[PDB]
Structure formats: structure tokens, C-alpha cells
Amino acid sequence: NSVENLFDTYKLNDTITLKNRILMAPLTRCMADANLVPTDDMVAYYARRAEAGLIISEATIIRPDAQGYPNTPGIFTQAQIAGWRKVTDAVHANGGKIFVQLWHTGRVAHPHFFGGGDVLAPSAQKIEGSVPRMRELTYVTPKAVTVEDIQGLVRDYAKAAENVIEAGFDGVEIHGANGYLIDQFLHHDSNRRTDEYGGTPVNMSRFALEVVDAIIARIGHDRTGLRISPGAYFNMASDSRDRVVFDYLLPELEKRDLAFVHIGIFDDSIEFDYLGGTASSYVRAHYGKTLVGVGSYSAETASKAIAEDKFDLIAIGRPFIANPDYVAKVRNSEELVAYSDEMLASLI
């Protein structure tokens, strides 16, 4: 089956044209240094994947209380900016483009990482268990943020975006997906607020739009994308009312003319009854601009989906871990190395 359309050039907007439709999905590797600064190993890892139309970086924290896993990079200190500059220079020298994925974990943060402070979330809705590979770090009940806390978070997302431009990135993907802070406001399970950030679709969408709008004001809409998870699957329980939240959010997002919206899902064959089907097909039916699909696609099934007008670009995750030369191999009809979790131990 054909993969020809994956090698079409794709104009995102006047600012950015991608050399092909293949994106490297954001992939947390937990290999930044103790100061959360990218390393030379990380520089080389991203550089060798610059055949992608666009790389989305691993989730990168906007400030200290965003941290929930060990050694995830940040971009709030000057040293972190300098480390990322090495990454972006290498990607560009290798002919690529790269966006940072800006991250706050919300209720999934853990105070071990930031000196014992409050975990912040829309509501005091604790998650169960402990940080992966650190069982001693039991999750805690979040403090429900105040409006002033929210404005501080919005400011820090925007400042992080400014830092991203300083570090030489082509843009930002806002992590509004997969159960983390922005997604926590967008679902009823996690957002039990009764103020202007809870209840109705406009209120539950407010935080996401404030973050989007604050970042656009600093770096521009052409360099701003957003990942979303209308279908709850990762650290999030669904609620049928979540449907009307996203029915409102999507047309509002379209007004901002973002570089792209990106689905957050792992296996996109999964359907959500309240969305009337798959996460990607729900978004496609209710959003009319560039859409990045993802989640257990091969080059072949992604190409078919794009030919079927299901989405516009394909993000590839696990196969990009196993194949730095994913794009070259797909282009030249070469067979791919199978992904295995054991490969997570090395940054190649």
C-alpha cells in the first residue's frame, strides 16, 4: 500500500512549511540532567531525527511545581535555555524543524521534585498510587488553584514560550492532553469547580484558551499548536458531559488559527461513545483546520487515513524510538525495526 502522500510538503501557514507530513511524536525519556537541562545525548538523539517534517519534543516543564517524573527537562532557567539551544541548532543544521511541548502535570506532579510545595490542579481530586519507578513518592491531594494561581500559571506558560523562542525552537505545542494540567480543566472527573473555571463549557474551556491566547500574544499563532484528549484514557476518567466542553472548545480554537491541533491518544481505533466514535474522527468532524493524527498507526494506515481526509499530518512515536531513520526507511521502502520497551533504556 502507498505511502506517497506522506512525502507531500505541507504548508502550516505563511511562517512554516513542513518538508513532509511525518512528525516525531512527543516522547518523554527522563534523561535530562539533575538541573533538568538537555544533554549532549539528547542533542544527538533529536538531531538524527531531523528527516521528520517536524519534531515535537518530549514534554518540557514550564516551572518547578510542574514536575512529576524524574529528569524531565525544563525551559524556565537560563541554563535550560542554553541546553535547548544546542538541541535546536543541531536539528536545524540537520535540516529539520522542532517545536517544544510545554508541560505542567497538575495533579500528577509530586512535591519530592520541587521541595515539598503544593501540587496544583483545578480541584482537590487526588490520583491513586505513586510516581512510576519511585514507589515511595505517593501522590498527594492537590490544592484547588485560586484565580490568582491560574493567572500565574498562564503567565508562566507564556514566559516558557518566550524562552522557547530564545532557545531557537520553531514553535510550541501546548500539552493540553493526556490527563495533565490543561486537560484536567477540560474534564468533569478532574474539574469539580463552581467558579468561572468550572461547570459550563465556556468556563471549563477558559484555562486552555487563556494559555493558548497568552502564548499567541508572545510568539504568534503560526508557531503555536495544541495537543488535546477529548477521549479520556490516561490518568483521566470520562464523563458524558465532557462532550459539550469539547464541542465549545473546538470552534473557539479554530478562531485562533493555530499551526495545528494534535490528538492525544494511544490506540486511535478506540471509540468513545460520548464522542460518537474515535477521538480523531470526533475532532475532524468538529474542527476544520490542520489536524495531526497519532496512536498505533503505521506509515501505511496513516497514509490511507490522510487519503480519506481523516487528518492532515501523522505523528509517529514508538517506531521513532526504534528507528532514528524512520522517515528515510519509509521513503525508500525499507523495513523497520520493531519497537520494544527495552529500547527506552538507551537514547539512540
Ligand X SMILES: Cc1cc2nc3c(=O)[nH]c(=O)nc-3n(C[C@H](O)[C@H](O)[C@H](O)COP(=O)(O)O)c2cc1C
The footprint of ligand TNF (CB under 6 A) covers: 28, 59, 103, 175, 178, 180, 233-234, 264, 266
59 is in an annotated binding site: yes
Q: What backbone phi and psi angles, to 5 degrees, belong to 154?
A: -55, -50
Give which of ligand TNF, ligand X, none residue 227 binds (C-beta under 5 to 8 Å, depending on kind): ligand X
Which of these is catalytic: 139, 180, 297, 326? 180
Report if residue 316 touches ligand X, rule: CB under 6 A: yes
Nearer to ligand X, 144 or 265 (CB): 265
- 63 annotated ligand-binding residue: no
Task: Look at the block and give the residue holding cell 470526533.
Answer: 282
Tell me the three cell numbers of residue 56: 515535537
Interaction of residue 114 with ligand X, rule CB under 6 A: no
C-alpha of 134 from chain center: 24
DSSP state of 335: P
Alpha carbon of 248 to those of 183, 270, 283, 313: distances in Å?
Answer: 14, 23, 12, 24
Among 49, 54, 58, 203, binds ligand X (CB under 6 A): 58
Tell me 100's DSSP state: E
Which among 25-33, 42-50, 182-190, 273-281 is the span making contact with ligand X, rule CB under 6 A?
25-33
Give which of ligand X, ligand TNF, none residue 295 binds (C-beta under 5 to 8 Å, depending on kind): ligand X
Q: Is the distance from CB of 226 to CB of 192 less than 8 angstroms?
A: no
By CB under 6 A, residue 301 contacts ligand X: no
Residue whose grid cell is 468561572? 196
Q: Regarding beta strands 277-278 and 271-272, do their DSSP bridges make them parallel or antiparallel, or are they unpaired? A: antiparallel
- Residue 53 near ligand X by CB under 6 A: no
Q: Give the 3-state secondary structure of residue 24.
A: strand
DSSP 8-state assignment for residue 130:
B
The distance of closest approach from Cβ of residue 119 to ligand TNF in the complex, given in angstroms and rounded to an integer, is 16
**Residue ranges of the binding site for FMNH2:** 26, 28, 59, 101, 227, 296, 317-318
**Would you name the residues annotated as active-site residues?**
180
**Residue ranges of the binding site:** 26, 28, 59, 101, 227, 265, 296, 317-318
